[PDB]
Amino acid sequence: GRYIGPVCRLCRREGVKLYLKGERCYSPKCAMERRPYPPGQHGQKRARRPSDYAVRLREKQKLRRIYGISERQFRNLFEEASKKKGVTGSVFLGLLESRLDNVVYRLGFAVSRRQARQLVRHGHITVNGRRVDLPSYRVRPGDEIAVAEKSRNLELIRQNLEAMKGRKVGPWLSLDVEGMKGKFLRLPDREDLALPVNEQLVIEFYSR
Amino acid sequence: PTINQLVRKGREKVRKKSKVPALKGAPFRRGVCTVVRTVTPKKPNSALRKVAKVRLTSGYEVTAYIPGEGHNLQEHSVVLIRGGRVKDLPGVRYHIVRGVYDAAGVKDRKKSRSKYGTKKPK
Amino acid sequence: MLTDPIADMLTRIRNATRVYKESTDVPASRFKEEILRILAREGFIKGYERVDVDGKPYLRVYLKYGPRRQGPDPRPEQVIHHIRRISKPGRRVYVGVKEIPRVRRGLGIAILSTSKGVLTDREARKLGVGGELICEVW
Amino acid sequence: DFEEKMILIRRTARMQAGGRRFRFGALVVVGDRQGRVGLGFGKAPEVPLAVQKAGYYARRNMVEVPLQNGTIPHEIEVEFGASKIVLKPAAPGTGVIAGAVPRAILELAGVTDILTKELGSRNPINIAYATMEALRQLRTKADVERLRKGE
Amino acid sequence: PKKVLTGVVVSDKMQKTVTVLVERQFPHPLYGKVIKRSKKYLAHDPEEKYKLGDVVEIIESRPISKRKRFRVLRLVESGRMDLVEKYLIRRQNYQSLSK
RNA sequence: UAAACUCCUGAACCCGGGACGAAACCCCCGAGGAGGGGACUGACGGUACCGGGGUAAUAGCGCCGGCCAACUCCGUGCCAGCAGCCGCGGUAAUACGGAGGGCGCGAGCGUUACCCGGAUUCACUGGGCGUAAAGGGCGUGUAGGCGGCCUGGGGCGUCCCAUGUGA
RNA sequence: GGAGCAAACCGGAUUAGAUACCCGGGUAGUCCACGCCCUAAACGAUGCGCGCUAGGUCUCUGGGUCUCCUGGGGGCCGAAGCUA
Ligand SMILES: [Zn+2]
């Protein structure tokens, strides 16, 4: 399943702020903020010129952690992209961004993406009036993502939607906090994303 | 060669042969020992090894390296051949399988237990 | 006996270029014309003409080259980079229209032989007719 | 002021009664990542002082590359006598697939999508050089219809 | 339709039968070259009219015997001893092969 | 941030409801036809699903010298042993064995076996043969293979359209 | 058939040993006919035939009123190119 074990110890390994931490990573510590160096008994020690496989690998792992997803699933959603006509770089991320657990985070429903997952996998989250607790659901254009009636008044969501007030989020998503309803306008282009990742390395690393 | 030589004689095919007569191309073949004995290794190195000859199901008879620290294979003890060559020892292209049959696992080991039929402690 | 008249020409040409010769002859042929008539239509040469040598039909091929270069070895870039024969006399090669080759991504021509006549590549899918691939040129 | 990455720094050893003194091999690449690239190969008993020379020979030997929307202008094979190199154009989002060596060359060329392979020998030093004669022979359309014109 | 092949008689040494040999050039399924291959068929000649050297058109017919599944349709051109040799010349070669 | 600690969520389980798959044969009017009508039938199964209630609730495996990414301590001392290749072990081992930690991957992770790949190392695409493996000791010649310039008919090869097949 | 040379063979010396090097002698063989043998660093270690791609110089040979061209054959040097 998910990475369960410490997740703000990769925050370090990469050296790239991974806000898999809710309020934390923003605050004066994504851990990384306090310790900006690699984990372990070494880490803080003259770095070593990474190999091609490395840099590629590492740029490739950096991606998977952010979406907190199975490597089975990850790869198997990469192939899915390769096949379809279009640029594989962007398109790859598109599929990713059509994850029901992701659409949640990206819309703001849940504070982390680790929370955007459980909140779906607890039936808290519905689509088009019908419940869907499968974290993988591929969001199609137009689908109304939203919470159920059993959650309208739950501590957590009412402190996120409280913190979702108007503040723009996602150039491809309409969000109505008033009624707690969100919509997936369209598949996302590239410029709409800006993850600290090179989609032009990943494609490479997957040639071995 | 000219394409016309190819129409005629034609390109020749490789045909590879197995470095493991395990029969049935079987990933493992049961066998009982006949004699467990220590043998010194080859050119660049030296260390009295622990090996044994295993009479097979197929009426065969082969020598297979017993890896790991210490073993309890005597004479009439059955064992599972894993097939794999040890460069140190000339003419041994088979591995005894630990944690299987009369060949117990390894005593006290903790790292790589799967590669040695060793149960995880408590 | 001269095995393949057609590859000899492309070689006469090939060789004629490496030494940068203004002209080089090759025995006549109502077919060989159908080749040169193309290499000129596509600016690989200034053209040609049928000449008279000792009472024999020949074809002078006026060659073209780039400008003199700057620096080490003022060798001018070749106007005829490449001129290899694909369909050989020992190994004939015929292509259907639905598979005509593209020489060096569009910049190259694949002069071939078809029923409609002797044609280039784009001119072969223009009339949508395939044939025997004479040779590729760039 | 450009960009730098060395492919290897070998330890060549020579003979002389008593012992064996050594120099070094330093192959490097430089490229603004937008059409200008430079490979270099220097030598010096010092490992750093080597790549530092290679870097100067780099900025020296240059070559504009006819990048086509991030890729090659047309495929080419080029034999550098001992080693064979193959370059192909690729649609967007293909990536730099090549030996680690010619990769550096292209990734510094500004190349983003490419198909390549190394036939025959695979000596770094030579492959490099081939790849370099490769690019120094690429022909964009205009560069073509200009020659085949001569008006 | 009843398959038909053009060929050349190469034996009327049989009672009302003939040995028709037909070559069949065809592009090799790997090396392009157009390589000719040849087969022998036996045709039912009830009128004992078709002699040696004959070039004929034979038609896929209702079986006449063990290996007689073709009848000769019509002649093409008589005097053709030239081709017939080509076959009989290859015959004499087999001798100088064994040991 | 890992842990404890706080809060919330609530797999498991509990009760309640509970199928789709199943409309035809059958029957009346009509005529035993068309059509309209009326009636039975479910192994899976009291399962899926739905509603309510609801507890923080297994981690494992390979590796960490180079290829190949992840290093230190300790023991051992060409011993014990690792190994796919090059090789490591003879007091300082990131290669043997524990541990610390770390890289990969996760209900899998390794291993063996076999298949293609890499092997462009049988090469049509795509290799070669002066010394690296490789020109027949040298000729004549059979079958075969290959074949100059021109006009014409045929149109086998070849090319093309339609069409039948290509379940 | 057998003069000369000459494996083997004996002898002299050398050498620790010397079936070898060196020397004196020595038979098959080397030569002829007829037959068989069919091997090789049978080497240019480069199959053959044809067209193409600067020249310089030496030699062998054939033709042409010739300090020169024109064919053929044997060498060296080097345009381009080829090559690890
Ligand atoms: Zn963090």
Swiss-Prot record, chain A:
Q: What InterPro entries does this protein's entry cite?
A: Ribosomal_uS4, Ribosomal_uS4_bac-type, Ribosomal_uS4_CS, Ribosomal_uS4_N, S4_RNA-bd, S4_RNA-bd_sf
Chain sites annotated for binding Zn(2+) = 8, 11, 25, 30
The record's listing under SMART domains reads: Ribosomal_S4 (SM01390), S4 (SM00363)
User: GO:BP terms for this protein?
Assistant: ribosomal small subunit biogenesis; translation
Keywords of this entry: Metal-binding, Ribonucleoprotein, Ribosomal protein, RNA-binding, rRNA-binding, Zinc, Zinc-finger
Q: Which PANTHER family match?
A: 30S 40S RIBOSOMAL PROTEIN (PTHR11831), SMALL RIBOSOMAL SUBUNIT PROTEIN US4M (PTHR11831:SF4)
Q: Could you tell me what this protein is called? A: Small ribosomal subunit protein uS4
The gene that this protein is the product of is rpsD
UniProtKB/Swiss-Prot annotation, chain B:
GO CC annotation: small ribosomal subunit
Does tRNA processing appear among the keywords?
A: no
Select a single GO molecular function from the record's annotations and give it. Answer: rRNA binding
Magnesium recorded as keyword: no
Q: Which Pfam families match?
A: Ribosom_S12_S23
What residue spans carry the Basic residues bias annotation?
Answer: 108-119
Chain spans, region Disordered: 105-122
InterPro entries in UniProt: NA-bd_OB-fold, Ribosomal_uS12, Ribosomal_uS12_bac
Task: Tell me where in this chain the PTM 3-methylthioaspartic acid is found.
Answer: 88
Which keywords label this protein?
Answer: Methylation, Ribonucleoprotein, Ribosomal protein, RNA-binding, rRNA-binding, tRNA-binding
Domain of life of the organism in this record?
Bacteria
Any GO BP: translation
Its biological function? With S4 and S5 plays an important role in translational accuracy.
Hey, which family's this protein in? Answer: Belongs to the universal ribosomal protein uS12 family.
Q: How does it assemble?
A: Part of the 30S ribosomal subunit. Contacts proteins S8 and S17. May interact with IF1 in the 30S initiation complex.
Name of the protein in its database record = Small ribosomal subunit protein uS12
UniProtKB/Swiss-Prot annotation, chain C:
Gene Ontology CC terms: ribonucleoprotein complex; ribosome
Q: Which residues form a coiled coil?
A: none
Give the PROSITE patterns listed for this entry: RIBOSOMAL_S8
GO-annotated molecular function: rRNA binding; structural constituent of ribosome
Record keyword RNA-binding present: yes
Recorded hits in InterPro entries, A to Z, give: Ribosomal_uS8, Ribosomal_uS8_CS, Ribosomal_uS8_sf
Entry keyword set = Ribonucleoprotein, Ribosomal protein, RNA-binding, rRNA-binding
Q: What is one process in the GO biological process aspect for this record?
A: translation
Could you tell me the superkingdom of the organism this chain comes from?
A: Bacteria
Is Lipoprotein a UniProt keyword of this protein? no
Return the similarity comment: Belongs to the universal ribosomal protein uS8 family.
Q: What does this protein do?
A: One of the primary rRNA binding proteins, it binds directly to 16S rRNA central domain where it helps coordinate assembly of the platform of the 30S subunit.
> Which PANTHER family does this chain map to?
40S RIBOSOMAL PROTEIN S15A
- Whom does it interact with, and what assembly results? Part of the 30S ribosomal subunit. Contacts proteins S5 and S12.
Q: What is this protein called?
A: Small ribosomal subunit protein uS8
Q: What is the source species?
A: Thermus thermophilus (strain ATCC BAA-163 / DSM 7039 / HB27)
From Swiss-Prot, chain E:
PROSITE patterns with a match to the protein in the record? RIBOSOMAL_S17
Annotated Gene Ontology cellular components are: cytosolic small ribosomal subunit
Q: Provide the GO biological process annotations.
A: translation
Q: Which domain of life is it from?
A: Bacteria
Q: Which Pfam families match?
A: Ribosomal_S17 (PF00366)
Assigned keywords, A-Z = Ribonucleoprotein, Ribosomal protein, RNA-binding, rRNA-binding
Q: Does the keyword RNA-binding apply?
A: yes
Concerning InterPro entries, the annotation shows: NA-bd_OB-fold, Ribosomal_uS17, Ribosomal_uS17_bact/chlr, Ribosomal_uS17_CS
**GO MF term set:** rRNA binding; structural constituent of ribosome
Give the protein family: Belongs to the universal ribosomal protein uS17 family.
Q: Which PANTHER family match?
A: 40S RIBOSOMAL PROTEIN S11 FAMILY MEMBER (PTHR10744), SMALL RIBOSOMAL SUBUNIT PROTEIN US17M (PTHR10744:SF1)
Q: How does it assemble?
A: Part of the 30S ribosomal subunit.
Q: What does this protein do?
A: One of the primary rRNA binding proteins, it binds specifically to the 5'-end of 16S ribosomal RNA.
User: Know the name of this protein?
Assistant: Small ribosomal subunit protein uS17
Annotated source species: Thermus thermophilus (strain ATCC BAA-163 / DSM 7039 / HB27)
Q: Which gene encodes it?
A: rpsQ
